[PDB]
Ligand binder design. Structure first.
Ligand SMILES: COc1cccc(Oc2ccc3c(c2)S(=O)(=O)NCN3C2CC2)c1
Ligand SMILES: C=C(C)[C@H]1CN[C@H](C(=O)O)[C@H]1CC(=O)O
Ligand SMILES: C=C(C)[C@H]1CN[C@H](C(=O)O)[C@H]1CC(=O)O
Ligand SMILES: [Cl-]
Ligand SMILES: [Cl-]
Ligand SMILES: [Cl-]
Ligand SMILES: [Cl-]
Ligand SMILES: [Cl-]
Ligand SMILES: [Cl-]
Ligand SMILES: [Cl-]
Ligand SMILES: [Cl-]
Lengths: 254, 254
């Protein structure tokens, strides 16, 4: 039967290895928000699918020569039909793949410890005692690199100084850096919500710096893009996306 | 070729400019959507003629499947773009091609200040306080179509007594909230506009759903993808945020 290849990436709570006492195979290896979304999308549109982790473990960014990696590259090269992941819809990516409409909203915000006077990005940009950074090569880092807003230009100049020592390789490294040192992590708000539900010592600082979403990636010209968009809108209007987020985000309270 | 842009009078998106003499053409209008059009035209390089939608409607279908409003202007190729607070919904996205969203919103509650009402559940539980929505808009449709028990209950109340709880437009609803014991179900962007200016009113609770306004194009339009990319660029450059601040900022309230 026609089976779509879905590229994705391990990222809590979107895609995680399921825990079992024996080896797992196929789609049963995984669970998480994105698996539930795939199940709902397939139920509406009637397609079969095979989840496959992106081989290089990357979301998708450009090098100096305009060459892409990650899930974006898998779509460009027609090695996957869909990308289902917290793949941020951005200008540079939308030019080379097709995105569905967003299934989740988010903005860049600040993850930091509780109990401090810091209240906004302006509070970080004006000083240098508190170190701050972002995940290297993600859409958050790219936002600061490209911004012409004075405050975010200043922050990029700090972040990019000293061989980019303020950046981190992944979100888990950044979270541990926040917990151990005087460091603030610039992180997508949905991930902050997940983290602060589980670490009562951490909080979001200020509001959202920008406004964007995660969408399902398809190769340019894909006939599934518009169908997936429609299904996402249906799931939103029925309240199902809200229930899915609550299912996977809610912690044990603080 | 010069593009025909369908739109609708709605504060602060599209308003008649103020002048001492008769105005002509695009110079008749000002507002957020006119600023957005100018920025889209600068990026993509098109000329445009703004034309108010002749029947003064956003877009809904009747029992026989015929559409009206700005949606119908696109369907019949009498407009190339629709630039308005036109909510992206399942039923509309099936018949036109929306750009990606340029502004986020959700359904929420406009009510007077100083009361113990705190959520839609508080309204659904009782009958002393009347509540409704604008007739034939996406908000009314959300409640009509919901299967969530609370929203089914509220729709039962809203549609009773020949729909006396509904209003013809937002200004009528705002005046009803101010004068009587009435709560208006309203898109959060409009609530923010109103409460910035009228300190007797407030938003009750949070957002009931999550959606956005998109630029409409006819199915198959080659402009939809280009407009999406331009919107993403404008968001990442902070220009969409500046445009919202320009038109929404009021004095605020204690
Ligand atoms: C720059 O302005 C922006 C950026 C990002 C989203 C947005 O507005 C939304 C918000 C949500 C949303 C949609 C559009 S949708 O109608 O495109 N798909 C369904 N959802 C809900 C599942 C999330 C506006
Ligand atoms: C978890 C990672 C590295 C991803 C998820 N969304 C962003 C993206 O799609 O680029 C990255 C986060 C960020 O850059 O803050
Ligand atoms: C102002 C009006 C009637 C419009 C604006 N967006 C919705 C739409 O596009 O249907 C309507 C508001 C609402 O239904 O609360
Ligand atoms: Cl399957
Ligand atoms: Cl690597
Ligand atoms: Cl490439
Ligand atoms: Cl300092
Ligand atoms: Cl915010
Ligand atoms: Cl023009
Ligand atoms: Cl789209
Ligand atoms: Cl209050």
């Amino acid at each position: 039967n026609r089976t779509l290849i879905v590229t994705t990436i391990l990222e809590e709570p979107y895609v995680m290895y399921r825990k079992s006492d024996k080896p797992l195979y196929g789609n049963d290896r995984f669970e998480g928000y994105c698996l539930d979304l795939l199940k709902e999308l397939s139920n509406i549109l009637g397609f079969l699918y095979d989840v496959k982790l992106v081989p290089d473990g990357k979301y998708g960014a450009q090098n100096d020569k305009g060459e892409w990696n990650g899930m974006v590259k898998e779509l460009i090269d027609h090695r996957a039909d869909l990308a289902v992941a917290p793949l941020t819809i951005t200008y540079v990516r939308e030019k080379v793949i097709d995105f569905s409409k967003p299934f989740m909203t988010l903005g860049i915000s600040i993850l930091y410890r509780k109990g401090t006077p810091i209240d906004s990005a302006d509070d970080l940009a004006k000083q240098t005692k508190i170190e701050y950074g972002a995940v290297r090569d993600g859409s958050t880092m790219t936002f600061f690199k490209k911004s012409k807003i004075s405050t975010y230009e200043k922050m990029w100049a700090f972040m990019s100084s000293r061989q980019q020592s303020a950046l981190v390789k992944n979100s888990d490294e950044g979270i541990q850096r926040v917990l151990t040192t005087d460091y603030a992590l610039l992180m997508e708000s949905t991930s902050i919500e997940y983290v602060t539900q589980r670490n009562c010592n951490l909080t979001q600082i200020g509001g959202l710096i920008d406004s964007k979403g995660y969408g399902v990636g398809t190769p340019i010209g894909s006939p599934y893009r518009d169908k997936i968009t429609i299904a996402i809108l249906q799931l939103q209007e029925e309240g199902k996306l809200h229930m899915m987020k609550e299912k996977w985000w809610r912690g044990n309270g603080c």
